[PDB]
């Protein structure tokens with residue numbers, strides 16, 4: 503739903519903070535959650551750590567809007583489903599998030615929201631989609647080698663996303 507983006511993104515920026523660089527962790531340095539590879543994709547060239555450190559909130563917002571929200575068709579997903587899919591997309595990429603949403607609603611997992619995906623999403627209850635997608639996300643994260651390091655924090659993140667998504671799903675302005 504269109505109005506979810508303005509509601510969800512302040513929580514993303516709040517939960518992320520500014521520049522975070524833990525070089526002993528995989529993924530590399532981030533600013534407001536934006537990684538170096540994602541900024542490189544935006545700029546059309548491999549950027550430096552200093553460029554990530556200097557990232558503006560305006561550019562971060564454009565990146566989240568165009569390369570995450572729009573790549574999961576957030577405007578067109580049901581309220582709540584949009585938020586659950588967006589956070590998964592932020593954490594693991596839009597293709598993996600949409601593939602898991604497609605697995606939940608029972609369509610071909612190609613990572614892109616098309617007509618068959620929208621039809622199957624709108625045939626199911628929104629809070630059921632939210633719960634099954636967050637469960638499928640947890641099951642998928644447990645297969646990663648990095649789960650031994652980040653799993654407890656990941657589990658807490660999914661729980662908070664599931665709660666806010668189900669809330670958005672019953673927000674009368676969405």
Ligand SMILES: CC(=O)N[C@@H]1[C@@H](O[C@H](C)C(=O)N[C@@H](C)C(=O)N[C@H](CCC(=O)O)C(=O)O)[C@H](O[C@@H]2O[C@H](CO)[C@@H](O)[C@H](O)[C@H]2NC(C)=O)[C@@H](CO)O[C@@H]1O
Nearest residue numbers: 528529532534535536537540592593594595596646648652
């Ligand atoms: C420790 C931790 O959670 N760090 C994450 C960090 O994610 C690291 C790289 C990660 O490991 N995420 C796990 C969940 C994951 O999905 N790993 C698979 C492994 C597949 C396999 O092993 O087969 C992968 O890396 O693909 C994540 O950055 C996102 O990383 C995705 C995957 O790279 C990109 O698609 C996204 O565009 C990118 N988002 C933005 C806004 O830039 C960032 C977001 O704020 O917040 C934390 O810093």
